[PDB]
C-alpha cells in the first residue's frame, strides 16, 4: 500500500551508489570517502587522547565527538568483516578491485539514514496529516516527495557524506517541539549539533522558541526553564565527558573546540552562490578592505538577516511559523557568511523540503523550483566526481513523480521569472559541454553558475521573509 515508497527510495539510494565516490583515482589526497575511512581507521587504533591530535595534515578530525563515536562503531563493525581495511597507516588510500570496502561504506550510509532520517520525516508528515485530516494519499504523496529530494540523495549516496544523520536529529527536534516535549527537543538539538557543527544555523530560532515558550508566552514558568537548562547541560556534559576523563583534561576540550571551529584563511577563494561570490567580481573586496573588516561585516550581515525572524518568534511563538523562521535564519547564514561552500544548502533545504506538506500550490511550486535550483548549483561538484548519469536520472525522476512533467505559482511576474531561471539553466549545460571558455576568462561558466543561483536563493529568502509577516496573523496552522 504505502510501504512500497519506503522501499523504492532505498533501492534508488542503492543504485545511485554504483557511481564513483569523491576522490576515486587521486593518489596524493583522495576525496571524502578517504576522510571517513581514515577516521574509522584512526578511532579504533588510538586512545581517546589522540583522536584530535594524531595527524592534522592528512584528513584530521573536523567534527564534534558524536561523529567520532559513530566512526568508532562503524569501524568496529567493519573491521569485523575484513581487518586489512582499517589498519593503522598501512591501509591508507585503500582501493580494492573487487569493490570491497565500497559496498560496506555505501551500506553504512544507507543504514544510518534509514535509522536517523526516515522515521523523523515520516512522523512529521503523519502528525501534519492527522492534525489536518489529510487523505492517506495526501500524506503519502507529501512523504514521497520528501524522500526523493535529489540534492541530499546525491550528496550522500554518490559523494559519501553523513548528512542525513545531522538533519534527522534536527527533524526529531522539530517533532518534539510539535508534540510539546521541550525538555527533549533541547536534547535532540544538542545531539544534532554534536554530529556536525553546521546545525548551529538554527540555534537563533530554537533558543528563542524554547525561551518564549518557557518564561514569556503562557506564564513566567520558572520550572520548565530549569528543566530545559538542565537537559541541555546534561547532554553536553555526557557527550564531552569521555574527552575529559578518558582524554587528557581541559587541553583536550580546547583542542577539540579549535578543531571544530577553525580559523579562516583566504578571502572569498571559493565559488559559492553567496552574496560575496557575486559582488566580489565588481567590487574586488580583496583590493579595498582587509580580512578583519570582511569577517566583521559578514557577521553583522548574517546577524541583521536573522534578527527580524528570531524576534518574530521570541515575541510570537507558534507552531505554524517554524518552517519559515527556520528558512529565514539558515538561508541568512548561507547568503552572508564569510566562508560558505557549494554544499551547506542542505541546511536551508531541510526546512524548505519540509514545506512539501503544505496545502497551497504557490508554496509547492516555489518548493519544487528551489529544489531544482539547489540541485543545479551542485553540478560543478558532481561533475568532477563522475556522476553525470546519476545527476540526470535523479534530476528527471524527482521532477517526474512530483507531476512537473504533466505547475508554477500564480502570477505573470512569477511564472515568467521561473521560466527564465529554467531557460538560463538549460543554457549553462550547453555552454558547458560544447562551447569552450573564452580562453581569456578561464572559468566563465562556473561564475555564471555561482551567479544564476544567487538570484533565485535571494528571491526565495525574501519570499519567506514575506510569508513570516503576511502570515502569522492568527493564521490557520492548516495552511
Amino acid at each position, epitope marked *: 500500500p504505502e510501504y512500497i515508497i519506503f522501499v523504492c527510495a532505498v533501492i534508488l539510494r542503492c543504485t545511485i551508489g554504483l557511481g564513483p565516490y569523491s576522490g576515486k583515482g587521486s593518489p596524493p589526497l583522495y576525496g571524502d570517502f578517504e576522510a571517513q575511512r581514515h577516521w574509522m581507521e584512526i578511532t579504533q587504533h588510538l586512545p581517546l587522547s589522540k583522536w584530535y591530535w594524531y595527524d592534522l595534515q592528512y584528513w584530521g578530525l573536523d567534527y564534534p565527538p558524536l561523529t567520532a563515536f559513530h566512526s568508532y562503531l562503524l569501524g568496529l563493525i567493519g573491521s569485523f568483516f575484513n581487518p586489512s581495511w582499517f589498519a593503522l597507516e598501512k591501509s591508507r588510500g585503500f582501493e580494492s578491485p573487487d569493490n570491497g570496502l565500497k559496498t560496506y561504506m555505501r551500506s553504512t550510509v544507507i543504514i544510518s539514514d534509514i535509522l536517523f532520517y526516515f522515521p523523523a520525516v515520516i512522523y512529521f508528515t503523519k502528525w501534519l496529516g492527522r492534525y489536518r485530516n489529510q487523505s492517506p494519499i495526501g500524506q503519502s504523496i507529501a512523504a514521497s516527495a520528501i524522500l526523493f529530494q535529489p540534492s541530499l540523495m546525491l550528496i550522500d549516496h554518490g559523494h559519501f557524506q553523513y548528512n542525513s544523520v545531522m538533519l534527522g536529529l534536527t527533524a526529531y527536534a522539530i517533532n518534539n517541539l510539535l508534540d510539546e516535549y521541550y525538555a527533549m527537543a533541547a536534547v535532540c538539538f544538542v545531539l544534532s549539533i554534536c554530529f556536525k557543527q553546521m546545525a548551529l544555523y538554527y540555534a537563533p530560532i530554537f533558543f528563542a522558541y524554547l525561551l518564549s515558550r518557557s518564561l514569556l508566552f503562557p506564564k513566567f514558568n520558572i520550572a520548565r526553564l530549569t528543566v530545559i537548562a538542565f537537559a541541555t547541560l546534561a547532554t553536553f556534559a555526557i557527550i564531552f565527558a569521555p574527552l575529559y576523563f578518558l582524554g587528557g583534561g581541559l587541553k583536550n576540550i580546547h583542542q577539540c573546540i579549535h*578543531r571544530i571551529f577553525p*580559523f579562516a584563511r*583566504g578571502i572569498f577563494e571559493d565559488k559559492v552562490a553567496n552574496f560575496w561570490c557575486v559582488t566580489n567580481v565588481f567590487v574586488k573586496y580583496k583590493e579595498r578592505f582587509t*580580512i578583519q573588516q570582511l569577517q566583521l561585516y559578514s557577521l553583522i550581515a548574517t546577524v541583521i538577516g536573522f534578527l527580524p525572524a528570531m524576534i518574530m518568534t521570541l515575541l510570537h511563538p507558534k507552531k505554524h511559523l517554524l518552517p519559515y523562521v527556520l528558512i529565514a535564519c539558515s538561508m541568512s547564514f548561507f547568503l552572508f557568511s564569510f566562508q560558505v561552500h557549494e554544499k551547506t544548502i542542505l541546511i536551508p533545504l531541510l526546512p524548505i523540503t519540509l514545506l512539501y506538506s503544505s496545502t497551497d500550490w504557490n508554496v509547492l511550486s516555489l518548493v519544487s523550483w528551489i529544489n531544482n535550483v539547489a540541485l543545479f548549483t551542485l553540478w560543478p561538484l558532481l561533475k568532477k566526481d563522475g556522476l553525470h548519469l546519476q545527476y540526470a536520472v535523479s534530476f528527471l525522476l524527482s521532477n517526474w513523480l512530483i507531476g512537473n512533467f504533466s505547475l508554477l505559482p500564480y502570477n505573470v511576474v512569477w511564472k515568467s521569472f521561473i521560466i527564465g531561471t529554467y531557460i538560463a539553466m538549460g543554457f549553462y549545460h550547453f555552454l558547458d559541454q560544447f562551447v569552450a571558455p573564452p580562453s581569456k576568462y578561464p572559468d566563465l561558466w562556473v561564475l555564471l553558475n555561482c551567479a544564476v543561483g544567487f538570484i533565485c536563493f535571494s528571491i526565495f529568502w525574501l519570499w519567506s521573509y514575506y510569508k513570516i509577516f503576511t502570515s502569522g496573523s492568527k493564521s490557520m496552522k492548516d495552511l
Partner: antibody
Amino acid sequence: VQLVESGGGLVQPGGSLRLSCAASGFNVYSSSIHWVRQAPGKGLEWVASISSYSGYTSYADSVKGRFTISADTSKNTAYLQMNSLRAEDTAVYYCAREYWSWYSYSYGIDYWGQGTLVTVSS
Amino acid sequence: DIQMTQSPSSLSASVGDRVTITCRASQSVSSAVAWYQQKPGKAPKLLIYSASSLYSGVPSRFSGSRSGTDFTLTISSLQPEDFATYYCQQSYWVGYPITFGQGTKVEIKR
C-alpha cells in the same frame, strides 16, 4: 613565561642541525610558533612557521626543501631541522610565539627567545 | 608576494623631538601590523600590535596608525631610552608567512 633555545654551533657546510626551543609558562599547542634569523650585520628575517591547531607549516623560499619545523606538543617544545646548510645561513636564530584569536585578530610576536648562534662554515 | 617597504633606513633626532616612521605594504589585505623595537644585540620587543593597539608596559609616547597601506609609528617625545632599531611586521593569517620591514635605526643628533 620564557622560551629557551638550545643546540647550535660550528657545522660544516652540508651538515645538519636540530635546534630546540623549550617553552615555559604557556602551552605551545595554541601559540603558532615561528623561527626567525638575524644574520651578522643584517635585518630580522623569517624562516619557518607552525600553527599547532592545524599543523600548517610554511617556509621562506631561501630555506624551502631544506628545513623541517615541528612541535613536540606533549612536552611543550619546538624543533627545527636544517639539512643542507648552505654557507649563507650563519645567523642568530630566535623562536618566537605569536598568539592568534577569532576573526583574524593577532597579538604580535610577544615572546622571543634569547637566540642561538649557527655558524655554517669550515 | 608579501613585503613591507620601510621608510627610511636612517634619520637623526634630538632628545625631545617627535618622530614618525612609515611602512607600506604591497597590498592592504590585513591590518595585523605589529611594531617591534630592538636594541643592539638583544631580542626585539613588541611595542604596538594590530597597527594601533599599544602593548602593556610600553610607554605612552608610542602610537601607531594605518592609512590604506601606509602604516606609521609615532614617538611623541623621544626620550634617551628610545634610540634603537624599529621594525614593522605584517602577517596575513595563521597558515601564511609573515614579513619584516628593513629596519629604521634612530640615532642621536649633534
